[PDB]
Structure 1
């Protein structure tokens, strides 16, 4: 029971392309296609990502596959960062999937942007690390999801997702 069996809890699951809560166009679980107003750009980037003219619908196995391609993009992506790697080491794997949720969500740069919270995580001052993951580009964006993930750091378990 881990990241897949986390984000799938985090974002629901539609085979169809759809708007995210921030209004960026999206298909699958958290898989941004384009920020562009044109949906066709989303369908086209989807056309490259899937290798076929999906036109907003895909076989569920392709959804699982693209979902794996994105989670794998998160896993050659967290490692390159100078800051995230020691923190990814300090986390229990149950929190490591949470860091994967972070880098998958706000992007690697924003997860890089919470340097103090991460410093508290590697030092395992989990409480203030949580209070600092709480002073907001992420926590303000998805406050319930961010609460679930920060709780995931607080607990060492999936309990926020209950």
Structure 2
């Protein structure tokens, strides 16, 4: 298992514009288009992202290319972030993937906001961190996915995804 296979399981794949769990226009493998309520504004963002007139539909290769970019940006955002970087550097490979997952889903600012949980991960207090991570809107809104990520931090294995 690796970060790409993990996120593909969590986000799924859709080739037509769709609404995410928060009601936002998205496409592909969890690629957020816009928070704006207008489907048209979403189509404009999409064509601009792809570089062609898509009419709201893309191909699998195009979905994977946006995904490759999105994973790369998540990793680079972690390494550039003064709060995230030290946590990432302290973690083993599996747990590094769980943090990438969270950043992909909620963005760098969002994750950096989990100040207490981050300190616990850095300290290698797995069980305590897992309990703290669950006291969040994140967990309450997407419990099945949050549980998978949290178990990954707790055990340092890919068991929740197998």
TM-score, normalising length: structure 1 = 0.95
Q: Which runs of 5+ in 2 are unaligned?
A: none
User: Deviation digits for residues 59-92 of structure 1, max 9, x if unmatched?
Assistant: 2111110111111110131112111111111221
Give the Cα–Cα distance (whole angstroms) in 2 for the partners of residues 79 and 141 of structure 1. Answer: 27
Aligned with 1:78: secondary structure?
helix
Q: State whether structure 2 residue 125 is matched by structure 1 residue 140.
A: no
User: Deviation digits for residues 78-135 of structure 1, max 9, x if unmatched?
Assistant: 1121111111112211111110111111111111111111111111001101111111
Any runs of at least 4 consecutive aligned residues in structure 1 with deviations exceeding 3 A, and if so which? none
Measure how far apart 1:137 and its partner are.
4.8
Give the Cα–Cα distance (whole angstroms) in 2 for the partners of residues 77 and 30 of structure 1. Answer: 17
Q: Is the 8 A contact 1:106 1:137 kept in 2?
A: no
Q: Which runs of 5+ in 1 are unaligned?
A: none
Measure how far apart 1:34 and its partner are.
0.6
Pick closer, same or farther for the CA change 1:5–1:144 going to 2, 3 Å.
Answer: closer
Q: Is the 8 A contact 1:110 1:137 kept in 2?
A: no
Aligned residues: 162
Higher helix share: 2
TM-score, normalising length: structure 2 = 0.95
